Design a protein around this ligand. Structure first.
Ligand SMILES: *Cc1ccc(S(=O)(=O)N2CCC[C@@H](OC)C2)cc1
Ligand SMILES: *Cc1ccc(S(=O)(=O)N2CCC[C@@H](OC)C2)cc1
Lengths: 9, 227, 227, 9
């Protein structure tokens, strides 16, 4: 299950 | 970072992102929060990107170590998993402390308050991933409470395609599936969120459509894995 | 890491590699070197892998920042490039200090002495990448001297297919091309190294053949880019 | 120009 990757502005 | 200007910390956080120096990026954005002013939308995203990358690397390392430890069941694997776990917990506590002192209480607009409450749910969720026993229970409830408050505001104040509303629902569905042992609640939330966004896409510009459909695809990807 | 057993530091360095925690891996291997015993082949490789990953990330960040700084030509980009540069220099100085106190002087077998002298050339080369002016000259000469001593031993004591001998020649050729402004010396060294290895492949087992041909391909890849 | 990647034990 993926959460928001959220790692790139 | 008390002696560096706020604007310089923001500038350096953007450079640190370009350089893939996420620990530096998080330290610059912590310094910027501690100046005491509220954060703009772009600044909130820099704070979140920095910490998500730092804690994401810690979580990936903790999972590698926990897997080796479980297979082995000397003290070294457990000791080193504990080291990484304590570091991860410290980063989560730092982010939660910024949110508590004083980002959430000063956030009045829905966009900012929902963003920070989603972060609060996420970092308690990362604490819950490594927690055991009764500590786990109270940490789980703290994640759930933060996500629920964010959901209640988002449903009253934002359209169903808003990207923060969508990403909140995605991450709360992951919380239900992976942490709270509630796969049916996870599937129901992801399906309802996807369907209500689909029905509002007609209102969007081309660029907003792209932003919303990207997150919808992540909801769909989870539903495919869970069903 | 003075209170941790040598064997535990080695064990934890291997776990840190699996977890992609290279800063931890380098700190464990520094602790292991500082126990004062010589390093086995496997332990030398753990030391080198740890520091190459740490300094490799620093170099990549320094290049991003130096590029932004050159394009811009406030103080922030230069200040932050300087920060990263100082950190990189400190890591290189730490590795060079381990080699000087006392890994090289205790290394009598060709395999260990060549390995450490190649490391010494590499870390002076990384210092040279960020150095300017006359500092650059003495740093360049220190890299060249270390690589040359390693080359002289390798040519007397190792076969032309030995992987350390090959990787030394590859990295010394990169030094000539990128640092010393000697592209023709770089091309000549890579060609001679490749040809003399080719002529010795017939002596190798299947597994040694694979190890040597992998490095030969890197020599070929550089020759293709340089010619 | 590539040096030994050297980043995997
Ligand atoms: C938690 C979360 C939700 C959504 C995103 S995003 O869609 O990648 N994004 C970040 C920039 C601002 C907004 O863009 C319209 C939303 C990121 C994190
Ligand atoms: C500097 C250098 C040269 C060669 C290598 S390798 O071939 O990847 N390797 C490391 C394990 C021991 C030897 O394997 C036979 C050589 C690495 C670094």
């Amino acid at each position: 299950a993926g959460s928001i990757p959220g790692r790139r502005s | 970072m008390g002696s560096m200007e706020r604007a310089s910390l923001i500038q350096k956080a953007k450079l640190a992102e370009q350089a893939e120096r996420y620990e530096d990026m998080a330290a610059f954005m912590k310094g910027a929060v501690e100046k005491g002013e509220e954060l703009s939308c772009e600044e909130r995203n820099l704070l979140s990107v920095a910490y998500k990358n730092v804690v994401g690397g810690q979580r990936a390392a903790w999972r590698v170590l926990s897997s080796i430890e479980q297979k082995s069941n000397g003290p070294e694997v457990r000791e080193y998993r504990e080291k990484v776990e304590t570091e991860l917990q410290g980063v989560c506590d730092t982010v939660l402390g910024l949110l508590d002192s004083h980002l959430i209480k000063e956030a009045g607009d829905a966009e900012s308050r929902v963003f920070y409450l989603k972060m609060k749910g996420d970092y308690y969720r990362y604490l819950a991933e490594v927690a055991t026993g009764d500590d786990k229970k109270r940490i789980i409830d703290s994640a759930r409470s933060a996500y629920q408050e964010a959901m209640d505001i988002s449903k009253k104040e934002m359209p169903p395609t808003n990207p923060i509303r969508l990403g909140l629902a995605l991450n709360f569905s992951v919380f239900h599936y992976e942490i709270a042992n509630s796969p049916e609640e996870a599937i129901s939330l992801a399906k309802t969120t996807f369907d209500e966004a689909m029905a509002d896409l007609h209102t969007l510009s081309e660029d907003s459509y792209k932003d919303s459909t990207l997150i919808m695809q992540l909801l769909r990807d989870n539903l495919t894995l869970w069903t």
